[PDB]
Amino acid sequence: ASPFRLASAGEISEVQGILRTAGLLGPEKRIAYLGVLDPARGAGSEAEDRRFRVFIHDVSGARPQEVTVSVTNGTVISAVELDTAATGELPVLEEEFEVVEQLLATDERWLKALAARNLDVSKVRVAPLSAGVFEYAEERGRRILRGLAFVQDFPEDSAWAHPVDGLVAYVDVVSKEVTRVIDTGVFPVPAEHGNYTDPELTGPLRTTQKPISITQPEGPSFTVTGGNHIEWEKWSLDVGFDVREGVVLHNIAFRDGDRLRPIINRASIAEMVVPYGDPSPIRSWQNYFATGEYLVGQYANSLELGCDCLGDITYLSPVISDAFGNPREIRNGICMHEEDWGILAKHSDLWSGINYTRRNRRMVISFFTTIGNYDYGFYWYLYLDGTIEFEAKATGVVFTSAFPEGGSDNISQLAPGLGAPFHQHIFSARLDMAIDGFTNRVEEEDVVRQTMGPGNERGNAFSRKRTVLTRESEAVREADARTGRTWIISNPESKNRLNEPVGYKLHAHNQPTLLADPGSSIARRAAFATKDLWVTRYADDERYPTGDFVNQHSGGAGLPSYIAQDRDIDGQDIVVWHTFGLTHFPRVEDWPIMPVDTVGFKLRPEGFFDRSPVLDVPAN
Amino acid sequence: ASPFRLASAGEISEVQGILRTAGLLGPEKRIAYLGVLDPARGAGSEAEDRRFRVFIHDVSGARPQEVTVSVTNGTVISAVELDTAATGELPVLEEEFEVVEQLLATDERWLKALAARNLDVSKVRVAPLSAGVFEYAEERGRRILRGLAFVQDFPEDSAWAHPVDGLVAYVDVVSKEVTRVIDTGVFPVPAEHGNYTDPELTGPLRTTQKPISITQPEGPSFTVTGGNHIEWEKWSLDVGFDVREGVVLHNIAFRDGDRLRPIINRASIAEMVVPYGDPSPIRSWQNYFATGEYLVGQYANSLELGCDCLGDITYLSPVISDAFGNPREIRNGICMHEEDWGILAKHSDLWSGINYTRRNRRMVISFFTTIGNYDYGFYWYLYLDGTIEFEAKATGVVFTSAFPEGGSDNISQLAPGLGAPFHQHIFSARLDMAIDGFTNRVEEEDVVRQTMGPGNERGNAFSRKRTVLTRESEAVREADARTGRTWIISNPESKNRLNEPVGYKLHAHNQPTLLADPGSSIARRAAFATKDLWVTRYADDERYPTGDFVNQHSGGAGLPSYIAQDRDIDGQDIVVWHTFGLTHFPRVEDWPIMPVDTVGFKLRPEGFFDRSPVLDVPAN
Ligand SMILES: [Cu+2]
Ligand SMILES: [Cu+2]
């Protein structure tokens, strides 16, 4: 009965039926996106009306549509025709992936380019890459995908070890036409294989690792009810899943005394982009929006016990729609478990003679997705002390290219003749705040150094300052590690026993943001990535920092346009959008399969509680 | 019979005997420091002469001495008379802590100050704080300690909850006289107790935490030989212990196939300082060097199984000297264990159909120390992929004061009338580098943004630049989180299969450095804390970033003096000194006992290996 329950197979089938009945889902139609709509602010209808939103693609080219339906009433609430040439193309369909290689396989220009390289077409894999928006006039109003080739010597061969540089093709996946085939010259195809499961490369397997047994005799400390409602060590929340954003956390709250205190209404990674910094014409257009263009949730992996999730794990198997509206379950796509997290608090007192030690723990909610060569792990952590944290784990195989003989300033060499273009992995966390309720405000906190003089004769004093962001136009902030800059989200109407507004402090990793030139296509399409922190007034239709349609869409929507409304955010229903990412200069150690690298952020209570909230943790 | 073996109780007793028979250990003498000397560069001399370094304090005031003895030959190698007024005072003795409170208890000025506040002198605890160096001319030449009072209502009461503000005294612990008692006014002593084990504060203990069993049925994957030589998953190292620095890692090396490749010769936290930023004259002089002035190693805690260290733990029990030269063992003062560390590498390939997942592990070597109200955990981690990491965990009870009526810009309120002065916890990691040998160099790597134009028409390109630090005069570097600055330690004479110098990249947390005014005493005495990274040419006598006798030294000793030599560091035996710390604006949540906060750094292989070094890890 929870209005925050996961989408069921039945609801998805019902959406399919409603669309069919409305004459909106004929045989030429495809569901590019389907997701449940969150309830509007303030308990509207007496009961909860379950609604879903869908992006309908048309394989014949007719205009696509955005439709919202009520599975409860079996009706179409609204259907609008989409002008893709203006608002953007629909997310890429998995069924379009193979279309690129297949079409090029019969194109004389492509075959000629391969022959010139002595490559057998039957062994050439082509990666279906999003196209973005550049200077190609013919692409206006065309659903395009670009292809980069990789040689696969045999069925189980890792094609990434064999990039075919100097070649790229543009394909219209709807009209089934190869618009362009660019060949800037023949580069040697890196010879070494990158098969990390081949003993020839792994050598004899280590026999030195002893087993580590992690078990919970009496079961986990958390409970799961209503299918996705979690309660663990004072925490309370609902675990949602969206085909686009993946795991989404709802109603994060903390039990303080006799009341459930809200902290975050909705938390998610609203976008993740991978911009490449190689100026070569073959890849200078490369910018992969995993979330917005491909929909990361769609590719969530089924997690194996013992391998992906170790210990006493509780799985959730979310359901998504396939391209035809049929429900598809992602078996064990979300795993949840608690784990020991070292020392929480400790003190040995020289005067009282009392020695005290308490261990910490954290609740883990995660999923792992795979998009082509990359694999990303998304982890949300809840700690005993009230800290909330997110961590992204990037691994998989690096996207490759040829390494020029004369060397490069935008590519690193991973093996003889094998290159790895520089790139970034930039995420955007959308945090719909609710610190003790919806009346919130954000304060930028900087360390303040003081000059030696009257009032500070020894020159030891240092302080800090807090600046309230009152309007959206002044809520676009940059990190400043040098001054220990953080952002506090507080509730001006809710004070702790010391008469201070309760709050939570956001700690960023302060990694470099988007490096692209500000006048580049990517700087516009990924504007959110140019600044560390954005604050907007909550609005039902402001969901992603890049807008609803990112594929082949120019700038104009997303965060920059939202902030333009310059709404009041001083003690209002606000949303924090935090940009964070990794700048990757591939190492030889990253080849042939890369070890995990991490990035993220966390929010710690700041005067939210009246004292430590973990004084009731048992000794043993 | 390793030259890096832990000191035995016998060796300490032997040092004591040598000193006594030499007439250097009379009744008035005290061992202020005692530690074994590392082998000098070049072990080409069979049988290493075991030598110990000793700082001998004279409670009579007669000049103290620095003595080097050979326990192998039973002789005094050298004994130098120390002029403390010039080179600094000796480290504070634990037995001196007590003298401050006892001396003040008989001083009329102190008693009057307490009487006015209606405090029973028998209930007043006095924290023995180091002095420092300021405008007090009568202190030069005198061994001083300052005292700050706290009320302890009963034997098991936490005195930190009851600071006595507006009062501070200075005492000459040698002549045993109170030189000054400053009373700036009466402040209410905070009323609430901070007894975190008292049910009235903890409330009913949670009964919701289910047990987590962590075991290793076949034992740990690491071996310990020669008492302290560790070998784990290709790693090799020696775990040493010094009363001043605590746990020290020696000869960190990694088995790359046929050869044992060195990485770091010696790693340690050579200093840790806690500067306070409250301009009040009661505390504006407060700066305590846990390592240099108090010797954090001597206060290492005995770690209890199941509380401090969980899982299959292997303990080391280092032995230190007491103030009289008697050996004292710190039972289970060092914990060593391995632990699962999530996903190491993962990839599901769409073309090969191969799914691959491998788990990561880390070797943990740690200890926990207690200095008055603070407790610090020191952790060194070795990862499967070759990464080396250090992490400091700060907890304990915050140093308190009164919270002024009218508020404060340098103190936070944690309870009614109770304040917590702003301060920092700044560490210095001394890394004697040995990347594939001693011929090393350091390069500062910055991200480089590129402007849109010829050669970068789309404005997507970005690069990086490396600057070799060739002389010490140019090796005092600052962090720059915005340009993703890191430092690479490479060996220009050792190349990987791609003909590139092998190296390791240092990743800093980019936290704020010393905030105090550049003209302050603390900015001079802890100059190392003003910059993130220093590189010096290796030298036997350059051990600490603050010099050998930190206590009451005028400043400039250590790093500033070493760097002044302006030696060649481009492809030489070098040492990296990394400054990193936490800036603490205490939160209500930190009271009455604070949750652990962390800070650290790590080093990852950068073209050190010819490809991923963890391809030989099994599935398990
Ligand atoms: Cu990457
Ligand atoms: Cu602190």
Short mmCIF file of N, CA, C and O in Angstrom, two decimals, chain B residues 116-214:
data_model
loop_
_atom_site.label_atom_id
_atom_site.label_comp_id
_atom_site.label_asym_id
_atom_site.label_seq_id
_atom_site.Cartn_x
_atom_site.Cartn_y
_atom_site.Cartn_z
N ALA B 116 37.53 31.42 44.80
CA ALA B 116 36.58 32.39 44.27
C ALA B 116 35.51 31.70 43.42
O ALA B 116 34.38 32.17 43.32
N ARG B 117 35.87 30.57 42.83
CA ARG B 117 34.96 29.82 41.98
C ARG B 117 34.27 28.71 42.77
O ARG B 117 33.48 27.93 42.23
N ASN B 118 34.59 28.65 44.06
CA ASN B 118 34.02 27.65 44.96
C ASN B 118 34.30 26.23 44.51
O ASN B 118 33.42 25.37 44.54
N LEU B 119 35.54 26.00 44.10
CA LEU B 119 35.96 24.69 43.65
C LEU B 119 36.90 24.05 44.66
O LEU B 119 37.87 24.66 45.10
N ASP B 120 36.59 22.82 45.04
CA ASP B 120 37.42 22.07 45.98
C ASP B 120 38.70 21.70 45.21
O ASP B 120 38.63 21.00 44.20
N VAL B 121 39.85 22.16 45.69
CA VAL B 121 41.12 21.88 45.03
C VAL B 121 41.36 20.40 44.78
O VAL B 121 42.00 20.02 43.80
N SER B 122 40.84 19.55 45.66
CA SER B 122 41.02 18.11 45.50
C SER B 122 40.21 17.56 44.32
O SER B 122 40.43 16.43 43.88
N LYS B 123 39.28 18.36 43.80
CA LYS B 123 38.46 17.92 42.68
C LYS B 123 38.91 18.54 41.37
O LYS B 123 38.33 18.27 40.32
N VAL B 124 39.94 19.37 41.42
CA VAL B 124 40.42 20.03 40.22
C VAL B 124 41.59 19.34 39.52
O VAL B 124 42.70 19.28 40.05
N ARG B 125 41.31 18.81 38.33
CA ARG B 125 42.34 18.15 37.53
C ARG B 125 43.00 19.24 36.70
O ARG B 125 42.35 20.20 36.29
N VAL B 126 44.30 19.09 36.45
CA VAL B 126 45.01 20.08 35.66
C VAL B 126 45.71 19.40 34.50
O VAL B 126 46.56 18.53 34.70
N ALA B 127 45.35 19.80 33.28
CA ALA B 127 45.96 19.24 32.09
C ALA B 127 47.35 19.84 31.95
O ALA B 127 47.51 21.06 32.00
N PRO B 128 48.39 19.00 31.79
CA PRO B 128 49.78 19.42 31.64
C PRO B 128 50.06 19.72 30.16
O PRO B 128 50.44 18.83 29.41
N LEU B 129 49.88 20.97 29.74
CA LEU B 129 50.10 21.32 28.35
C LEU B 129 51.51 21.84 28.10
O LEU B 129 52.11 22.49 28.96
N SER B 130 52.05 21.54 26.92
CA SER B 130 53.38 22.01 26.56
C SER B 130 53.32 23.54 26.54
O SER B 130 52.24 24.13 26.41
N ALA B 131 54.48 24.18 26.68
CA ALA B 131 54.54 25.63 26.74
C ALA B 131 54.56 26.38 25.43
O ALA B 131 53.71 27.23 25.18
N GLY B 132 55.56 26.07 24.60
CA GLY B 132 55.71 26.76 23.33
C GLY B 132 56.74 27.87 23.54
O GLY B 132 57.53 27.80 24.49
N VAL B 133 56.73 28.88 22.68
CA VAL B 133 57.68 29.98 22.80
C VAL B 133 57.01 31.29 22.43
O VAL B 133 56.62 31.50 21.29
N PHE B 134 56.87 32.18 23.42
CA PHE B 134 56.24 33.47 23.17
C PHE B 134 57.02 34.63 23.78
O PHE B 134 58.25 34.60 23.79
N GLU B 135 56.32 35.63 24.30
CA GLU B 135 56.97 36.81 24.86
C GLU B 135 57.41 36.69 26.32
O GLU B 135 57.72 37.69 26.97
N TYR B 136 57.45 35.46 26.84
CA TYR B 136 57.83 35.23 28.23
C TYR B 136 59.33 35.02 28.38
O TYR B 136 59.82 33.89 28.38
N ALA B 137 60.06 36.13 28.52
CA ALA B 137 61.51 36.12 28.65
C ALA B 137 62.07 35.29 29.81
O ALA B 137 63.18 34.77 29.71
N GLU B 138 61.33 35.17 30.90
CA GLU B 138 61.84 34.40 32.03
C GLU B 138 61.78 32.90 31.78
O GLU B 138 62.36 32.12 32.52
N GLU B 139 61.08 32.50 30.72
CA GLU B 139 60.94 31.08 30.40
C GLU B 139 62.13 30.49 29.66
O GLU B 139 62.43 29.30 29.78
N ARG B 140 62.81 31.32 28.87
CA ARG B 140 63.97 30.84 28.13
C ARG B 140 64.98 30.32 29.15
O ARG B 140 65.41 31.06 30.04
N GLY B 141 65.32 29.04 29.04
CA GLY B 141 66.25 28.44 29.98
C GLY B 141 65.52 27.62 31.03
O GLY B 141 66.12 26.80 31.72
N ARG B 142 64.21 27.82 31.14
CA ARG B 142 63.41 27.08 32.11
C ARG B 142 62.53 26.05 31.41
O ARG B 142 61.98 26.32 30.33
N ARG B 143 62.42 24.87 32.01
CA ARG B 143 61.59 23.81 31.47
C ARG B 143 60.19 24.08 32.01
O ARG B 143 59.91 23.90 33.19
N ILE B 144 59.31 24.53 31.12
CA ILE B 144 57.96 24.89 31.52
C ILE B 144 56.80 24.08 30.98
O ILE B 144 56.88 23.46 29.92
N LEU B 145 55.72 24.07 31.75
CA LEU B 145 54.47 23.42 31.39
C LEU B 145 53.37 24.38 31.84
O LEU B 145 53.51 25.07 32.85
N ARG B 146 52.28 24.44 31.08
CA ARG B 146 51.18 25.32 31.43
C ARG B 146 50.04 24.44 31.92
O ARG B 146 49.93 23.28 31.52
N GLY B 147 49.20 24.98 32.80
CA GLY B 147 48.10 24.20 33.32
C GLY B 147 46.72 24.80 33.11
O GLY B 147 46.50 25.99 33.35
N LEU B 148 45.79 23.97 32.65
CA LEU B 148 44.41 24.38 32.43
C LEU B 148 43.60 23.44 33.30
O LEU B 148 43.82 22.22 33.27
N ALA B 149 42.68 24.00 34.07
CA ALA B 149 41.88 23.22 35.01
C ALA B 149 40.53 22.70 34.54
O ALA B 149 39.83 23.34 33.76
N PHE B 150 40.17 21.53 35.05
CA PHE B 150 38.91 20.86 34.76
C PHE B 150 38.42 20.24 36.06
O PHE B 150 39.21 19.69 36.83
N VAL B 151 37.12 20.33 36.31
CA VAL B 151 36.57 19.78 37.54
C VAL B 151 36.08 18.34 37.36
O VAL B 151 35.36 18.02 36.42
N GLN B 152 36.48 17.48 38.29
CA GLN B 152 36.06 16.09 38.27
C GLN B 152 35.23 15.91 39.55
O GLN B 152 35.78 15.87 40.65
N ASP B 153 33.91 15.81 39.39
CA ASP B 153 33.00 15.67 40.53
C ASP B 153 33.20 14.41 41.36
O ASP B 153 32.95 14.41 42.56
N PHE B 154 33.63 13.33 40.71
CA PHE B 154 33.86 12.08 41.41
C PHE B 154 34.86 11.25 40.61
O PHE B 154 35.10 11.52 39.44
N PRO B 155 35.47 10.23 41.24
CA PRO B 155 36.46 9.37 40.59
C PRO B 155 36.23 8.94 39.14
O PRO B 155 37.16 8.94 38.34
N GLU B 156 35.00 8.58 38.78
CA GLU B 156 34.72 8.14 37.42
C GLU B 156 34.12 9.23 36.53
O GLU B 156 33.65 8.94 35.42
N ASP B 157 34.16 10.47 36.99
CA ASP B 157 33.60 11.59 36.24
C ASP B 157 34.53 12.10 35.13
O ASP B 157 35.75 12.14 35.28
N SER B 158 33.93 12.49 34.00
CA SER B 158 34.69 13.02 32.87
C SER B 158 34.89 14.51 33.12
O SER B 158 33.97 15.31 32.93
N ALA B 159 36.10 14.87 33.54
CA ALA B 159 36.43 16.25 33.85
C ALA B 159 36.31 17.20 32.67
O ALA B 159 36.08 18.40 32.86
N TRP B 160 36.47 16.68 31.46
CA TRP B 160 36.39 17.51 30.26
C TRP B 160 35.07 18.25 30.12
O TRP B 160 34.98 19.27 29.44
N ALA B 161 34.03 17.75 30.78
CA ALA B 161 32.72 18.39 30.74
C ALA B 161 32.69 19.65 31.60
O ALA B 161 31.78 20.47 31.48
N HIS B 162 33.70 19.80 32.46
CA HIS B 162 33.74 20.94 33.37
C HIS B 162 34.99 21.81 33.32
O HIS B 162 35.72 21.93 34.31
N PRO B 163 35.25 22.45 32.17
CA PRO B 163 36.44 23.31 32.09
C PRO B 163 36.30 24.54 32.99
O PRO B 163 35.19 25.03 33.23
N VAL B 164 37.43 25.03 33.50
CA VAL B 164 37.46 26.21 34.35
C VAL B 164 38.12 27.32 33.54
O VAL B 164 39.34 27.47 33.56
N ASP B 165 37.32 28.08 32.81
CA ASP B 165 37.86 29.14 31.96
C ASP B 165 38.33 30.37 32.71
O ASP B 165 38.05 30.54 33.91
N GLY B 166 39.04 31.25 32.00
CA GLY B 166 39.55 32.47 32.60
C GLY B 166 40.68 32.23 33.58
O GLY B 166 41.06 33.12 34.34
N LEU B 167 41.24 31.02 33.54
CA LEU B 167 42.32 30.64 34.45
C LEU B 167 43.38 29.78 33.76
O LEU B 167 43.05 28.81 33.08
N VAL B 168 44.64 30.14 33.95
CA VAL B 168 45.75 29.38 33.39
C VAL B 168 46.99 29.70 34.22
O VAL B 168 47.17 30.83 34.69
N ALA B 169 47.84 28.70 34.41
CA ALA B 169 49.06 28.88 35.18
C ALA B 169 50.25 28.32 34.43
O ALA B 169 50.10 27.44 33.58
N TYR B 170 51.43 28.86 34.73
CA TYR B 170 52.66 28.41 34.10
C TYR B 170 53.55 27.89 35.21
O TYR B 170 53.68 28.54 36.26
N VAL B 171 54.15 26.73 35.00
CA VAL B 171 55.01 26.16 36.03
C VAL B 171 56.36 25.67 35.51
O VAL B 171 56.45 25.07 34.43
N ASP B 172 57.40 25.94 36.29
CA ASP B 172 58.75 25.49 35.98
C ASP B 172 58.79 24.14 36.68
O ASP B 172 58.87 24.09 37.90
N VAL B 173 58.71 23.06 35.91
CA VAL B 173 58.69 21.74 36.51
C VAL B 173 60.00 21.28 37.12
O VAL B 173 60.03 20.31 37.86
N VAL B 174 61.10 21.97 36.80
CA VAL B 174 62.40 21.60 37.35
C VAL B 174 62.64 22.28 38.69
O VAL B 174 62.94 21.61 39.68
N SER B 175 62.51 23.60 38.73
CA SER B 175 62.71 24.34 39.98
C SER B 175 61.47 24.19 40.85
O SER B 175 61.46 24.62 42.01
N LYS B 176 60.44 23.58 40.29
CA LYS B 176 59.18 23.35 40.98
C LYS B 176 58.54 24.61 41.54
O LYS B 176 58.19 24.68 42.72
N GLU B 177 58.39 25.62 40.69
CA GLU B 177 57.76 26.85 41.12
C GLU B 177 56.76 27.34 40.08
O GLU B 177 56.94 27.14 38.87
N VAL B 178 55.69 27.95 40.57
CA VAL B 178 54.66 28.48 39.70
C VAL B 178 55.15 29.87 39.31
O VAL B 178 55.26 30.75 40.16
N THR B 179 55.48 30.06 38.04
CA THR B 179 55.98 31.35 37.59
C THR B 179 54.89 32.38 37.41
O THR B 179 55.11 33.57 37.61
N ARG B 180 53.69 31.93 37.03
CA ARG B 180 52.58 32.84 36.83
C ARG B 180 51.22 32.17 36.92
O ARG B 180 51.06 31.00 36.56
N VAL B 181 50.25 32.92 37.42
CA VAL B 181 48.88 32.46 37.53
C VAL B 181 48.06 33.61 36.96
O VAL B 181 48.03 34.70 37.53
N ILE B 182 47.42 33.37 35.82
CA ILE B 182 46.62 34.39 35.17
C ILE B 182 45.14 34.11 35.33
O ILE B 182 44.66 33.02 35.01
N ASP B 183 44.42 35.09 35.86
CA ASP B 183 42.98 34.98 36.06
C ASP B 183 42.36 36.17 35.34
O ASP B 183 42.50 37.31 35.79
N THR B 184 41.69 35.92 34.23
CA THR B 184 41.08 36.99 33.44
C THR B 184 39.61 37.21 33.78
O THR B 184 38.94 38.05 33.19
N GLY B 185 39.11 36.45 34.74
CA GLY B 185 37.72 36.60 35.12
C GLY B 185 37.05 35.26 35.32
O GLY B 185 37.50 34.24 34.81
N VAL B 186 35.95 35.28 36.07
CA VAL B 186 35.22 34.07 36.37
C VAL B 186 34.23 33.69 35.27
O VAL B 186 33.51 34.53 34.73
N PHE B 187 34.21 32.41 34.93
CA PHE B 187 33.29 31.90 33.93
C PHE B 187 32.61 30.72 34.60
O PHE B 187 33.26 29.94 35.30
N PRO B 188 31.29 30.59 34.42
CA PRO B 188 30.60 29.46 35.03
C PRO B 188 31.24 28.17 34.54
O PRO B 188 31.60 28.05 33.37
N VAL B 189 31.40 27.20 35.43
CA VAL B 189 31.95 25.92 35.00
C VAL B 189 30.74 25.18 34.44
O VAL B 189 29.74 25.01 35.13
N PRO B 190 30.81 24.76 33.16
CA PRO B 190 29.70 24.03 32.52
C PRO B 190 29.14 22.98 33.47
O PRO B 190 29.89 22.16 33.99
N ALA B 191 27.83 23.02 33.69
CA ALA B 191 27.15 22.13 34.62
C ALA B 191 26.90 20.68 34.23
O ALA B 191 27.10 19.78 35.04
N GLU B 192 26.43 20.44 33.02
CA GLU B 192 26.13 19.08 32.58
C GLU B 192 27.34 18.17 32.59
O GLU B 192 28.45 18.61 32.31
N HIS B 193 27.12 16.90 32.91
CA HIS B 193 28.21 15.94 32.92
C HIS B 193 28.32 15.36 31.51
O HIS B 193 27.38 15.44 30.73
N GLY B 194 29.48 14.80 31.19
CA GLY B 194 29.68 14.20 29.89
C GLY B 194 30.07 12.75 30.06
O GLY B 194 30.99 12.25 29.39
N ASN B 195 29.37 12.06 30.96
CA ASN B 195 29.66 10.66 31.23
C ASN B 195 28.89 9.74 30.29
O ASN B 195 27.77 9.33 30.57
N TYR B 196 29.54 9.41 29.17
CA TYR B 196 28.97 8.57 28.13
C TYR B 196 28.68 7.11 28.49
O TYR B 196 28.19 6.36 27.64
N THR B 197 29.00 6.69 29.71
CA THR B 197 28.70 5.32 30.10
C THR B 197 27.57 5.34 31.12
O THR B 197 27.12 4.29 31.59
N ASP B 198 27.10 6.54 31.44
CA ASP B 198 26.02 6.74 32.40
C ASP B 198 24.67 6.57 31.69
O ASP B 198 24.37 7.28 30.72
N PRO B 199 23.84 5.63 32.16
CA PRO B 199 22.53 5.35 31.58
C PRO B 199 21.63 6.58 31.39
O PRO B 199 20.80 6.61 30.49
N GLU B 200 21.80 7.60 32.24
CA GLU B 200 20.97 8.79 32.11
C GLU B 200 21.36 9.62 30.89
O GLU B 200 20.64 10.53 30.48
N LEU B 201 22.51 9.29 30.31
CA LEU B 201 22.98 10.00 29.13
C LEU B 201 22.84 9.12 27.89
O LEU B 201 22.52 9.61 26.81
N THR B 202 23.09 7.83 28.06
CA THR B 202 23.00 6.89 26.95
C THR B 202 21.55 6.49 26.68
O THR B 202 21.16 6.28 25.52
N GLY B 203 20.76 6.40 27.74
CA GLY B 203 19.39 5.97 27.60
C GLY B 203 19.44 4.47 27.45
O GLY B 203 20.50 3.88 27.62
N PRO B 204 18.32 3.80 27.13
CA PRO B 204 18.33 2.35 26.97
C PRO B 204 19.24 1.94 25.81
O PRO B 204 19.15 2.51 24.73
N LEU B 205 20.10 0.95 26.04
CA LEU B 205 21.00 0.50 24.99
C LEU B 205 20.24 -0.22 23.89
O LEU B 205 19.26 -0.93 24.15
N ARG B 206 20.68 -0.04 22.65
CA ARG B 206 20.05 -0.68 21.51
C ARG B 206 20.17 -2.19 21.64
O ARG B 206 21.18 -2.69 22.14
N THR B 207 19.15 -2.89 21.19
CA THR B 207 19.14 -4.35 21.23
C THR B 207 18.91 -4.84 19.81
O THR B 207 18.67 -6.03 19.57
N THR B 208 19.00 -3.91 18.86
CA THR B 208 18.76 -4.21 17.45
C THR B 208 19.96 -4.63 16.62
O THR B 208 19.80 -5.10 15.49
N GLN B 209 21.17 -4.48 17.15
CA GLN B 209 22.36 -4.86 16.39
C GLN B 209 22.64 -6.35 16.45
O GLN B 209 22.98 -6.88 17.51
N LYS B 210 22.50 -7.02 15.32
CA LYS B 210 22.77 -8.45 15.23
C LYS B 210 24.27 -8.62 15.03
O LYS B 210 24.92 -7.76 14.44
N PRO B 211 24.83 -9.73 15.52
CA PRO B 211 26.26 -9.99 15.38
C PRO B 211 26.77 -10.21 13.96
O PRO B 211 26.06 -10.72 13.09
N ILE B 212 28.01 -9.81 13.73
CA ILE B 212 28.68 -9.99 12.45
C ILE B 212 29.91 -10.82 12.75
O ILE B 212 30.83 -10.36 13.43
N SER B 213 29.92 -12.06 12.27
CA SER B 213 31.04 -12.95 12.50
C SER B 213 32.06 -12.91 11.37
O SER B 213 31.74 -13.20 10.22
N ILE B 214 33.29 -12.54 11.70
CA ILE B 214 34.36 -12.47 10.71
C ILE B 214 35.45 -13.42 11.15
O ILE B 214 36.10 -13.21 12.17
#
